């Protein structure tokens, strides 16, 4: 019932701030579960060795201050709200081969009564691929994409892969290329600014091979 949905949103967002991290005590870390969905290779530039892919950047976390009691709102257990209204970890794609950070479209999130947020915004990413020179009767190249938070560090936000590989369940395949292999690995990265402070990334690669 929409009367109940309307009331819910107003009470969720009357005293909400999207600027502060949604933890009870500030020393806590926001846990964010991350997955990369590869949808389609849309452009392949064999001169400059660049491939453009359509991806989805799946993100999952709990916002403490967005819980409700379904009994109070006629049994509503989940709602769709605009991603612009909420705190987000500001997660970005990089080694983008023309322009630094890939622009990610702010689609609606699914918010559940437990505070659980699921968000799957679409994006277009230009990987710069390296040619594999191991054994090439048929050609191979290895394309990579880095994920990380733009501002927060590992102690404010922890990112965790939902799985070892990118999600290919919605991947439409090519007539020329095939994804031979793909993996996601997490990394702690140290920077010159900050000796005692960990940053975190997840790097997804895939090796594409030419069909005979």
């Amino acid at each position, epitope marked *: 019932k929409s009367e109940h949905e309307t009331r*819910l949103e107003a009470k969720l967002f009357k005293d909400y701030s999207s600027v502060v991290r949604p933890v009870e005590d500030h020393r806590q870390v926001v846990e964010v579960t991350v997955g990369l969905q590869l949808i389609q290779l849309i452009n392949v530039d064999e001169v400059n060795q660049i491939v453009t892919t359509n991806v989805r950047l799946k993100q999952q976390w709990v916002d403490y201050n967005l*819980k409700w009691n379904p*009994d*109070d709102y006629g049994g509503v257990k989940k709602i769709h709200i605009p991603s612009e209204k909420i705190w987000r970890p500001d997660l970005v794609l990089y080694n983008n081969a023309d322009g630094d950070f890939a622009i990610v479209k702010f689609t609606k999130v699914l918010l559940q009564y437990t505070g659980h947020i699921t968000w799957t915004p679409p994006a277009i990413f230009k990987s710069y691929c390296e040619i594999i020179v191991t054994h090439f009767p048929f050609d191979e190249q290895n394309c990579s994409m880095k994920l990380g938070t733009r501002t927060y560090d590992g102690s404010a936000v922890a990112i965790n892969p939902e799985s070892d590989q990118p999600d290919l369940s919605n991947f439409m395949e090519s007539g020329e290329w095939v994804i031979k292999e793909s993996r996601g690995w997490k990394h702690s990265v140290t920077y010159s600014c900050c000796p005692d402070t960990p940053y975190l990334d997840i790097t997804y690669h895939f090796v594409m091979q030419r069909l005979p």
Partner: antibody
Framework: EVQLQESGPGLVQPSETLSLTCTVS????????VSWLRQPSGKGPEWMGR???????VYNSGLKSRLSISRDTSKNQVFLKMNSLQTDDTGTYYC??????????????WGQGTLVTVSS | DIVITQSPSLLSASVGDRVTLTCKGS??????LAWYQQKLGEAPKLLIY???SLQTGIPSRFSGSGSGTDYTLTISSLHSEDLATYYC????????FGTGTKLELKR
């Protein structure tokens, strides 16, 4: 200074309808929610519904078809109506003032209660 | 919804004794648990909300603790006017109440 007073008919027969009144002092109903609870005979409390600060209502889904909740802010009064009664409905009925954090609510202040007994 | 069981169901204790009541949930409650007192003929009185926040005008002897599925109310030294029935209740997933602990004083 925060007070709640429930008034009802002692006796109601089966098939008749119960109407209760909650009279409030020490605050306005426009800035606080008020819930009806009841505790039947040989049973634990249950929440029946709410008169929201903003004027609307929400009901316990199991009782929704039998109930209606209303208020007259000029009188500082909340009302409950309940029909198709049965001997199960015998118990004590409370109005509460509810307290809120973001979208979460809890019961903060009670009235003394009114005894309602359903019998031929 | 969440189901709640209270213990001890009936409790005996002399004045000045330290007593603890326990409230065990069937699922995770995540600290949205309140405790209220009910003497006979009188309006129920909230003592504690959100596991351990003391309601204003409540004496310091009353205190709360717990997490996940297991919560306690403590009365550090029992007074005679504390003779009442104590109920716990839960306010994140519907509204369910404990069966209630009756406190009888040793004498």
């Amino acid at each position: 200074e925060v007070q709640l007073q429930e008034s009802g008919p002692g006796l109601v027969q089966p098939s008749e309808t119960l109407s209760l009144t909650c009279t409030v002092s020490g605050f306005s109903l426009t800035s606080y929610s008020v819930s009806w609870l009841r505790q039947p005979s040989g049973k634990g409390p249950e929440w029946m519904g709410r008169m929201w600060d903003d004027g609307g209502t929400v009901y316990n889904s199991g009782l929704k078809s039998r109930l209606s909740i209303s208020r007259d802010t000029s009188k500082n009064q909340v009302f409950l109506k309940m029909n198709s009664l049965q001997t199960d409905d015998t118990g004590t009925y409370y109005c509460t003032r509810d307290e809120r954090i973001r979208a979460i609510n809890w019961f903060a202040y009670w009235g003394q209660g009114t005894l309602v007994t359903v019998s031929s | 919804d969440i189901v709640i069981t209270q213990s001890p169901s009936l409790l005996s204790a002399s004045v000045g004794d330290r007593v603890t009541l326990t409230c065990k949930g069937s699922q995770n409650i995540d600290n949205y648990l309140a405790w209220y007192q009910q003497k006979l003929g009188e309006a129920p009185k909230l003592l504690i909300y959100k596991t351990n926040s003391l309601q204003t005008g409540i004496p310091s002897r009353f205190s709360g603790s717990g997490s996940g599925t297991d919560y306690t109310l403590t009365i550090s030294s029992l007074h005679s006017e504390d003779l009442a029935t104590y109920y716990c209740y839960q306010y994140i997933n519907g509204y369910t109440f404990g069966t209630g602990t009756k406190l009888e004083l040793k004498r």
